[PDB]
Amino acid sequence: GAMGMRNLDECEVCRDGGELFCCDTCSRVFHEDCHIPPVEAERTPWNCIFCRMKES
Ligand SMILES: [Zn+2]
Ligand SMILES: [Zn+2]
């Protein structure tokens, strides 16, 4: 068919040079959400906000 709607490259944040706080697997699925909130998230050192908050 069309494989699926899994082209999460519309991420303005990555274009803006924003940080990413998710594992590759976690980014593949929730990339857009993995940049929210893009304010004062982790940064010490680096944690996956989805893996930090379980449900993964
Ligand atoms: Zn992104
Ligand atoms: Zn993760």
Q: Give every CB contact of residue 6 below 8 A, 6+ residues apart in sequence.
A: 28
CATH 3.20.20.70 fits 1-56, yes or no: no
**21 CA → ligand 2 middle, Å:** 8
| Cβ 19 vs Cβ 34: under 8 Å | no
DSSP 40: S
18 alpha carbon, closest ligand: 1
- Name the experiment that determined this structure: NMR
- Residues near ion ligand 1 (Cβ under 5 Å): 11, 14
Domain boundaries, the chain: 1-56
**CA 42 / ligand 1 centre spacing (Å):** 16
**Looking at the CA of 10, which ligand is closest?**
1
Asked whether 35 and 18 are in contact (CB, 8 A), the reply is yes
